[PDB]
Amino acid sequence: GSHMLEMIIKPRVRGFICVTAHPTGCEANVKKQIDYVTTEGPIANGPKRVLVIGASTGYGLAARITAAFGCGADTLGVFFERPGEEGKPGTSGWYNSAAFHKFAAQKGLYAKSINGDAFSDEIKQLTIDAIKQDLGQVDQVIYSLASPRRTHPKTGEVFNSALKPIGNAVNLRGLDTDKEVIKESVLQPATQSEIDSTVAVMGGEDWQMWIDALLDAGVLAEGAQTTAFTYLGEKITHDIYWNGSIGAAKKDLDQKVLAIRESLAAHGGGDARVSVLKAVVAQASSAIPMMPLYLSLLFKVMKEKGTHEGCIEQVYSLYKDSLCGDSPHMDQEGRLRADYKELDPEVQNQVQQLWDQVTNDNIYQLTDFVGYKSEFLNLFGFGIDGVDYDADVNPDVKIPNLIQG
C-alpha cells in the first residue's frame, strides 16, 4: 500500500509561516509563470548561460524562468531548500525547483541546481565546478538571496539581521494575519551591532565574494552582467527600508555595485546594477506585520488602476526593458527600476490615505486582504486552479541534477 507513503497535503500555518507545501500546486505555479513568459514572447539578445543565486522562490525563481523560457538560457540555480519525505512535505522552493527541472528538460534546456548555503565558500566552489564542467562560463549572475541570518565564511560568526529604525523608536501599524486585527507596535532603534549585523546579512559583501571567487576561477564571460534585487518602497515603510537597519544594508549595495560594475565593464563592456522591484507577497511577509497591511492596500489600489502584478511580470519586464532592452529605468544612483508603478504618486497618495482609515471593522471594505491571503497560500502551492487537493501525493519529489552541498 503506497497509501502509507502518500498523503493529502493541506496548509498548516504555525505562527505566521506555512510549514507545508503542495508539490502539484507548486508545479502548476511554475507552469503558470512559464506560460506567462512564452505568451508575452521571447526576449532577444539576452544571456544564454545564467547563474541565479536564490533561484527557488519569488523573484529569483522568476528570473530563472525568464532567463530560461524568455531568453532561452541554460540556467544554474543555487538555493537552500528542504526535500520532502514520507509524512513531511518539503519546502515550496524544493517543489518549485523540481517543476523547473521538469519543464526545462521538456524544452531541451539545461537545468542544474545546487542546494546549500550560498554564503559558504564550499557552495561557491561547487558552483564553479558545475560551470567549468557544463557551461564553461556564465554571462549573467542574478543575486536574489533573502535570509535572516548569515554564517560568515571566514570567521564562522553567525550574523542576524534586524528590522528596526535608526535614531528614534517608531510606531508602526500592521496587520496580524493570525488574529486578523489591525495592530500597532513600537520598534526600538537598532544598536550599532544590529546595524553591522544587518549590513553583513543583507548588504553586498557576499554578492561581491561571488564575483570575486568566480573571477579568480575564470568562469565569467566577456560583457558579463550581474544584478542584485532589492526593495526601496516609499514613505510608509521608509523608517525601516530607507533610514533603518535594512536601509543601512541597502546603502551597502549602491556602493558595491559600483566596484562590481568597474570590474565587468573592463571585461568586454559587462555591466552591474542594483535592480529595485515592487513589493510582493513572499514567504516571510506575514511575520513582518506592516507588510500584510501595506500589500493588502497596495493590491486593491493597483488593481483599480490595472497595474497589479507579481514576480514573473516584474522580472520579465526587467529583462525585456532594462537588462536586455533599450528603455532602461536608470535612477540617479545608477539603479535599474522596475517599481515605478508601485511608486506612482497617486497610488502612494491613495494607499497612504487608506493607511490612516483602515480599522478592524473595514479591513475587507478598504483593502484587498482577500487577495493577500490568496497570494500567500499560492506561494506554497495551495488554491491553484486545476489542482485536485483531495488526491493523495507522494511528498518525496526528486530532482535530477541536484547537487547537495
Ligand SMILES: NC(=O)C1=CN([C@@H]2O[C@H](COP(=O)(O)OP(=O)(O)OC[C@H]3O[C@@H](n4cnc5c(N)ncnc54)[C@H](O)[C@@H]3O)[C@@H](O)[C@H]2O)C=CC1
Ligand atoms: N519580497 C519583496 O517584496 C521584494 C523582494 N526583493 C528582493 O528579492 C530577492 C529575493 O527575496 P524574495 O523573493 O523576497 O523572497 P524569497 O524568500 O522567495 O527568496 C529567497 C531565496 O533565497 C534562497 N536562500 C536563502 N538563504 C539561502 C542560503 N543561505 N543559501 C542559499 N540560498 C538561500 C532561498 O532558497 C530562495 O531561493 C531579495 O534580494 C529581496 O531583497 C525586492 C523587492 C521586493
